[PDB]
Design a protein around this ligand. Structure first.
Ligand SMILES: [Ca+2]
Ligand SMILES: [Ca+2]
Ligand SMILES: [Ca+2]
Ligand SMILES: [Ca+2]
Ligand code: NA
Length: 397
């Protein structure tokens, strides 16, 4: 009864959420910058806020070769990055342990500098920072293995306490370790600039707060890949998320079997032929039943956003990965309102039973005019017989 309702809901909410993810740009987007003989990159990072929503950090980036040698200017593509932050239980100093996995994708189905990345390469990181006049240094060390896009670093704040959250420095503190697939080796700018290296420059805008400006030199010093950085931060709020340390350090590396099974149920609403992959046709069917009407091109681009193997379809594991990440890094209010907007057909700020029934039956759920009410009940905080925004928020967690 309650069970069925709760279950029928998760499936819908998850499907809507999947469309939200597929309509978003969460990767690192790289483009050639012929005028500078380099590349540009653009992306955003989500920083979960302790007991709250999410902090956005909008990154603009340029990389320029230090040397005169030829480099590879890529076609447009992306890097997909997975990071984990941890603490060294024996470390007394303010520190961060970082693991990253970085892979290039985005282009559907080898430079001299790449030979320097065939095995495990030692890394040294040095940063000097100044944020609102609060100065600091970080040293880090570790190793990278481009064969797997793997890197592991440990950083120490050598000046005492870091005056900003460690997660805000992850992107600043070696994309040369990215795994490029065989068909995309001609688009690896980073390794092509080695050993002489490149300059990596960023402006990072933390929404509703200040911005970082960074300049780094990434180059070999003997056998070690070194990342030397300068960071300047201005316009930060003294009691904002950054200077006020209001950001979460790490997420459970967890995700229960029950959450995974919920993802699988949602997957199966898109994979209508049961073949274990989602096609543009399947994707378009679901979107249209939700009242959208994307073109073929939009459908291919939505799939391409999460298509790890470049086959043109969202395979079962690609979808699982995408959902896991959508649940770990929180949504903006604008994104939750878009999702709400799918159900709220008249746009009055209230999901009626008639609206919900419309959405469900459109998605091809066989539900009773009683199961429909049963669903509203579960979500209805204030007992008005409808679902408002704050109530939707709850229904989506
Ligand atoms: Ca299928
Ligand atoms: Ca695929
Ligand atoms: Ca409405
Ligand atoms: Ca209500
Ligand atoms: Na603001």
């Amino acid at each position: 009864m309650v069970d069925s309702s709760r279950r029928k809901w998760n499936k819908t909410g998850h499907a809507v959420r999947a469309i939200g993810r597929l309509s978003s740009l969460e990767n690192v987007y790289i483009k050639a910058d012929k005028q500078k003989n380099g590349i540009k990159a653009n992306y955003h990072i989500r920083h979960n806020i302790e007991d709250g929503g999410v902090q956005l950090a909008y990154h603009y980036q340029q990389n320029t070769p230090i040397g005169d040698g030829p480099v590879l200017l890529p076609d447009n593509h992306y890097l997909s990055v997975q990071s984990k932050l941890s603490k060294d239980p024996n470390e007394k100093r303010d520190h961060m342990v970082l693991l990253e996995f970085v892979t290039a994708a985005g282009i559907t189905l080898v430079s001299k500098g790449e030979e320097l990345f065939t095995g495990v390469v030692p890394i040294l990181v040095e940063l000097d920072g100044d944020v609102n006049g609060h100065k600091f240094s970080v040293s880090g060390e570790g190793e990278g293995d481009a064969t797997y896009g793997k890197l592991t670093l440990k950083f120490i704040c050598t000046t005492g306490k870091l005056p900003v959250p460690w997660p805000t420095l992850v992107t600043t503190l070696v994309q040369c370790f990215s795994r490029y697939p065989d068909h995309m080796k001609q688009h690896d700018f980073f390794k092509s600039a080695m050993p002489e290296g490149y300059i990596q420059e960023r402006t990072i805008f933390f929404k509703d707060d200040g911005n970082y400006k960074t300049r780094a030199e990434v180059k070999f010093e003997g056998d070690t890949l070194v990342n030397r950085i300068e960071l300047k931060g201005i316009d930060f709020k003294e009691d904002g998320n950054i200077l006020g340390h209001k950001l979460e350090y790490n997420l459970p590396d967890q995700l229960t079997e029950e959450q995974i099974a919920e993802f699988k149920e949602a997957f199966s609403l898109f994979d209508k032929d049961g073949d274990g992959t989602i096609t543009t046709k399947e994707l378009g069917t679901v979107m249209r039943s939700l009242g959208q009407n994307p073109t073929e091109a939009e459908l291919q681009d939505m799939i391409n956003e999460v298509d790890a193997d470049g086959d043109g379809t969202i395979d079962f594991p690609e979808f699982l990965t995408m959902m896991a990440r959508k649940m770990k890094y929180r949504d903006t209010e604008e994104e939750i309102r878009e999702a709400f907007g799918v159900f709220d057909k008249d746009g009055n700020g209230y999901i009626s039973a008639a609206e919900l029934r419309h959405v469900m039956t459109n998605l091809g759920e066989k539900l009773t005019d009683e199961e429909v009410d049963e669903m509203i009940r579960e979500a209805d905080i204030d007992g008005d017989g409808q679902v408002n925004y704050e109530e939707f928020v709850q229904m989506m967690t």
